[PDB]
């Protein structure tokens, strides 16, 4: 009962804490500057416990004179994965990010982002008088809100933690859903680009002030940055390097490929028509209303289609092991078209061809080879589970 | 690479399976019958693997002559927990359910469901000529979409598994959010009630046909049912009893109490005004726009307020142990108002009184007693974690 009073109070306090933490980037029009503002907080994990908050204040303004889109209030939701290159000796950061715009119910610059776009990033920094430089390269694919970059400190040892520079180191690569296209400032300013300025306040420590020019140089999207950091504590979490660094990337890549089977027109979203096409190809013929009911359950932004992050969340929504086992039993039954307990090379071929894969008979045979443990030329349920687990 | 082809194909097949399974109750108007229809599938777990599907077809029609509400298409989402009474020797089922209506963007009978309502359930059944009876009693609170019932087989051993009778054994207790009040058929038909008829098809087995009268008898909501089952297999999953039976209920009760601290007017939903009130009481003063941003992140139905199931999902959204540990560190800091590392009886009192609890100084002291391991009269961080973990 005293225990119950503590728990109930504890839960209420913890609820406020969960409601209170949003790391989303909140964007508003700044009509006087013909651009936008944003504000957001980043929570950096401290090694062996604690969070280091970083309060961001952002403004963006067009470089060029052409008209730009000024948005209604909305936000960007980002998921970042930081990693290392095992064959890299230089101080470095490998980065994978997916960003999508949301927060709103229901340009010529956008044509520049229909496919994969090469990116170069250059940063010249000075933190408490420690000068440093970073260069990065990779690619953006705004269809999926996706960025893939590697960064190198070109001046030796980076004097601050890599995660503190992530937000500084191309919001033009955000995926803005179809109903929000008129609110995408960042692409509207292209190719001439925009200036992005921030102040980033590290609580109980110093701050960064940043100015960047984001624009096309040829077919490359370039982010050239100046950063000045002042007032940092020599044994704070930043100059003292006390911050933590970091689905796998392999896993996400598999899910993207799987997503691509549904997203027939490659626009980064699955429609009821696309889902129906795939289901019909495997012999199931739900009605339009049934297909919408299915999409609705996983359609977190309520725009009526499934984007890749929503697909990801569905496929990452962890299950009871016993549900996981039954889902694999069900998938086996889909592959085993005649129900005899064995997936044949003909059956495998049929499922892959219908989902939209193109494979030779020889490639289908190699798939059976990897799975076929007892050498009968087919894949039974035990062998299927081993392939899938 | 063959491994990758299997995985990517497997994921696509498993995605269709996840999209395809919806156990939601889909409701449509049946204007010719002055009532509604529904259809849905229930997935019953089979002991040691497999699912037994049960396809439901439902119609409801008013008993009385008064006008009723006929809805636009929507659905009910339910979460059920089945349990046993340790001091019960009779064949029985204890049941806890939360049901909420959804699927739509943005009556006098409803007045009968503003508080807790007693429920009686009576079922007379015949499955493959095995006659049986069930009686149940409990309470519904439609404010939270909540049902709490205990059922007893009054004829001895139940000849079918309890989980197969759940849907048969009061959708008037569903929580219809404010924007959907005009689509709540079930309460609109009260007090005179409605007739609910189903056929339930157990795949590869027999079926139940059911007819029920749901109505008020005095202040009690009564569900009186006739069930006939035919064509069941003697060693199928139903007559062979091969189905599985079953947050804890304690846990959910704690979360409800915590929810109640926010839901000041007891209407079962937390508004920005309510959340602001609680946050202000603990010293934080977010703006209306900030409070809406907070609610939006957890507001799965997009109606702008947090209902109890949404609160539950937020508080059940499992975390990395290290995030869990930091959330407890943060909660400690909230209780420790002067930051000295110790929660005093005065500080505890202040937090509870401000959240809206009413406690005597003696009750606050007993809380400190349970937590205070080293007898200094206050609660340090180590003691707090033990109380909270
Ligand atoms: Ca598409
Ligand atoms: Ca969507
Ligand atoms: Ca076969
Ligand atoms: Ca084999
Ligand atoms: Ca309320
Ligand atoms: Ca809501
Ligand atoms: Ca204190
Ligand atoms: Ca103590």
From Swiss-Prot, chains A, B:
UniProt gene name: GFP
Gene Ontology terms: biological process: bioluminescence; generation of precursor metabolites and energy
Impact after mutating residue 46 to L: In R10-3; matures to the red-emitting state with excitation and emission maxima at 555 and 585 nm, respectively
Gene3D superfamilies per record: Green fluorescent protein (2.40.155.10)
Protein name, UniProt field: Green fluorescent protein
Effect caused by changing residue 78 to H/W/F: Results in significantly red-shifted excitation and emission maxima
Signal sequence range: none
Outcome (variant: residue 207 to T): In EBFP1.2; shifts the excitation and emission spectra to shorter wavelengths and increases quantum yields compared to BFP
InterPro entries: GFP, GFP-related, Green_fluorescent_prot
Family listed: Belongs to the GFP family.
PTMs per UniProt: Contains a chromophore consisting of modified amino acid residues. Maturation of the chromophore requires nothing other than molecular oxygen.
Effect of residue 201 to S: In alphaGFP/cycle 3 GFP; improves folding at 37 degrees Celsius, reduces aggregation at high concentrations, and increases the diffusibility of the protein inside cells
UniProt lineage: Eukaryota, Metazoa, Cnidaria, Hydrozoa, Hydroidolina
Keyword annotations of the record: Chromophore, Luminescence, Photoprotein
One Pfam family here: GFP
Subunit comment: Monomer.
Role, per record: Energy-transfer acceptor. Its role is to transduce the blue chemiluminescence of the protein aequorin into green fluorescent light by energy transfer. Fluoresces in vivo upon receiving energy from the Ca(2+)-activated photoprotein aequorin.
Effect on the protein of changing residue 205 to E: In mut1.27; shifts fluorescence lifetime from 3.03 to 2.85 ns
Biotech exploitation of the protein: Green fluorescent protein has been engineered to produce a vast number of variously colored mutants, fusion proteins, and biosensors. Further generation of mutants led to more stable proteins (at 37 degrees Celsius for example) with brighter fluorescence and longer fluorescence lifetimes.
Record annotation: effect of changing residue 230 to V: In EBFP2.0; shifts the excitation and emission spectra to shorter wavelengths and increases quantum yields compared to BFP
Tissue: Photocytes.
The organism of origin for this protein: Aequorea victoria (Water jellyfish)
Reported effect, residue 77 to F: In H9; increases fluorescence at 395 nm excitation
Annotated effect of mutating residue 174 to A: Increases fluorescence at warmer temperatures such as 37 degrees Celsius. In GFPmut 3; highly fluorescent mutant when excited at 488 nm
Annotated phenotype, changing residue 171 to L: In RSGFP4; increases fluorescence and shifts the major exitation peak to 489-490 nm
Effect of residue 144 to N: In EBFP1.2; shifts the excitation and emission spectra to shorter wavelengths and increases quantum yields compared to BFP
């Amino acid at each position: 009962s005293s225990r119950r009073k503590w728990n109930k109070t504890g839960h209420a306090v913890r609820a406020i804490g969960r409601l209170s933490s949003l790391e989303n980037v909140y964007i508003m029009a700044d009509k006087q500057k013909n651009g936008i503002k944003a504000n957001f907080k980043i929570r950096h994990n401290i090694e062996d416990g604690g969070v280091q908050l970083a309060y961001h204040y952002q403004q963006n303004t067009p470089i060029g004179d052409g008209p730009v889109l000024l948005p209604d209030n909305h936000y960007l939701s980002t998921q970042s994965k930081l990693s290392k290159d095992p064959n890299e000796k230089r101080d470095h950061m490998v980065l994978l990010e997916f960003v999508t715009a949301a927060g709103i119910t229901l340009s010529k610059g956008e044509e520049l982002f229909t496919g994969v776009v090469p990116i170069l990033v250059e940063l010249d920094g000075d933190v408490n008088g420690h000068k440093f430089s970073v260069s990065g390269e990779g690619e953006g694919d705004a269809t999926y809100g996706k960025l893939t970059l590697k960064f190198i400190c070109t001046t030796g040892k980076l004097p601050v933690p890599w995660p503190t520079l992530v937000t500084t180191l191309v919001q033009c690569f955000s995926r803005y859903p179809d109903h929000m296209k008129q609110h995408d400032f960042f692409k509207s300013a292209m190719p001439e680009g925009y200036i992005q300025e921030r102040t980033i306040f590290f609580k109980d420590d110093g701050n960064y002030k940043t100015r960047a020019e984001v624009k096309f140089e040829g077919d490359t999207l370039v982010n050239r940055i100046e950063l000045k950091g002042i007032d940092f504590k020599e044994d704070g979490n930043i100059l003292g390097h006390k911050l933590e660094y970091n689905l796998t990337e392999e896993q996400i890549a598999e899910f993207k490929e799987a997503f691509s089977l549904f997203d027939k027109d490659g626009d980064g979203t699955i429609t009821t028509k696309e889902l129906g096409t795939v289901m019909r190809s495997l012999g199931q013929n739900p009605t339009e209303a049934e297909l919408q009911d299915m999409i609705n359950e996983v359609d977190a932004d309520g725009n009526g289609t499934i984007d890749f992050p929503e697909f990801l969340t569905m496929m990452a929504r962890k299950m009871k092991d016993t549900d996981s086992e039954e889902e694999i039993r069900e998938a086996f039954r889909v592959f085993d078209k005649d129900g005899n307990g064995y997936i044949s090379a003909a059956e495998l071929r049929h499922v892959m061809t219908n989902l939209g894969e193109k494979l030779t008979d020889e490639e289908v045979d190699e798939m059976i080879r990897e799975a076929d443990i007892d050498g009968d030329g087919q894949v039974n349920y035990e062998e299927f589970v081993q392939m899938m687990t």
